[PDB]
C-alpha cells in the first residue's frame, strides 16, 4: 500500500477550482479500507484522547471545505484531530473526503481519530448519495467494502476524562460507560437501543426529559438530562455534531454542551459557517471558523 502516494495525489488538488476530482484505483481504496479497518478494531470502541486536539463535526462530502479545514487548523501531524462522523453523503465529493480521512488514520494512527456518524451506515449511505457516488465512479462491490469498514468505526471519545464526544448525543440506555465498551464490532446501526441513540439523538430546549425525535428515529433530550449526566460521570462538556448550526458552533444547556458543524453551506441551502474546536492542553477551547462565501 503506497500510502504517501495516495495522500499526495489527494492533497494535490488543493486550491484548483471547486470540485476537481481525484480518482484513485479501486485497489488503492480497498487498501485504505482494510488497513484502517484493522486499526479501528485494535483500538477501543470508546476512545480516550488527550489535549491538544482539534475537533470537527459533519463534513458530508464537501471535500474542498475539508481542505480549508486542514489549511486553517494545520494538516497532520501538525495538529491532533477528532472527527465526529458524517463524512460522506449529500456533498459532491464523498470519495475524496473519506479517502483522505482513512489515509490519515493509517499514517498517524495515534494523532488522528474518527468516530461514526449516522451516515456511516449502509442504511442511509445508499440513499443520500454515497452509494451513488461509488456506483458512478467505481462499482457496487466497492461500496459494499466501505460499509464493512464503517461497521468497525469507534462510537465515542472521552478527551481528558472531561469532554465526552459522539455524533448524535445521549441515550436513555447509556447509564454505564461500560455499556459502550461492551458493544461488539463489526456491527450495523440499529433502529432502537443504545448504539442507535448515540448517533441519532438531539438536544432540544423545549423538551423536558426524553421526547420524540422529529427525525423519526431515536429520541430528543433536554438540558436536565445533560447536567444530570455530566454530573454522574464527572464530565464538564459534551461535544457532538449531527445538526446544522448557523455559526458552526452552538451552545446548549448553557455551554454544558456544544454542537459542531464543519461543512459551510450544508447543501448551499444554509449560508452557515463551519466550525472547529481548538482544545489546548489546559482545556481552553476556542472555535476557529470557516466562513461560507458572500
Amino acid at each position: 500500500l503506497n500510502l504517501d502516494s495516495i495522500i499526495g495525489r489527494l492533497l494535490e488538488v488543493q486550491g484548483s477550482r471547486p470540485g476537481k476530482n481525484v480518482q484513485l484505483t479501486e485497489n488503492e481504496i480497498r487498501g485504505l479500507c482494510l488497513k484502517s479497518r484493522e486499526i479501528f478494531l485494535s483500538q477501543p470502541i470508546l476512545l480516550e484522547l488527550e489535549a491538544p486536539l482539534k475537533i470537527c463535526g459533519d463534513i458530508h462530502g464537501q471535500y474542498y471545505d475539508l481542505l480549508r479545514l486542514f489549511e486553517y487548523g494545520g494538516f497532520p501531524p501538525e495538529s491532533n484531530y477528532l472527527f465526529l462522523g458524517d463524512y460522506v453523503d449529500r456533498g459532491k465529493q464523498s470519495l475524496e473526503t473519506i479517502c483522505l480521512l482513512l489515509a490519515y488514520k493509517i499514517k498517524y494512527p495515534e494523532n488522528f481519530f474518527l468516530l461514526r456518524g449516522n451516515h456511516e451506515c449502509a442504511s442511509i449511505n445508499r440513499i443520500y448519495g454515497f452509494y451513488d457516488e461509488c456506483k458512478r465512479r467505481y462499482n457496487i462491490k466497492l461500496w459494499k467494502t466501505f460499509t464493512d469498514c464503517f461497521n468497525c468505526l469507534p462510537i465515542a471519545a472521552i478527551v481528558d476524562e472531561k469532554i465526552f464526544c459522539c455524533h448524535g448525543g445521549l441515550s436513555p440506555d447509556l447509564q454505564s460507560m461500560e455499556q459502550i465498551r461492551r458493544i461488539m464490532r463489526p456491527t450495523d446501526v440499529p433502529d432502537q437501543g443504545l448504539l442507535c441513540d448515540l448517533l441519532w439523538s438531539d438536544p432540544d430546549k423545549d423538551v423536558q426529559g426524553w421526547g420524540e425525535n422529529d427525525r423519526g428515529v431515536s429520541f430528543t433530550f433536554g438540558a436536565e438530562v445533560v447536567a444530570k449526566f455530566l454530573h454522574k460521570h464527572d464530565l464538564d462538556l459534551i461535544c457532538r455534531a449531527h445538526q446544522v448550526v448557523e455559526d458552526g458552533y452552538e451552545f446548549f444547556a448553557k455551554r454544558q454542551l456544544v454542537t459542531l458543524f464543519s461543512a459551510p453551506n450544508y447543501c448551499g441551502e444554509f449560508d452557515n459557517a463551519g466550525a472547529m474546536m481548538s482544545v489546548d492542553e489546559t482545556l481552553m477551547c476556542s472555535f476557529q471558523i470557516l466562513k461560507p462565501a458572500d
Binding site: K162, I163, D236, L237, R255, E281, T282, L283, M284, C285, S286, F287
Partner: peptide
Amino acid sequence: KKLRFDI
C-alpha cells in the same frame, strides 16, 4: 488547567 471557553 481545566475546562473553559473563548470568544
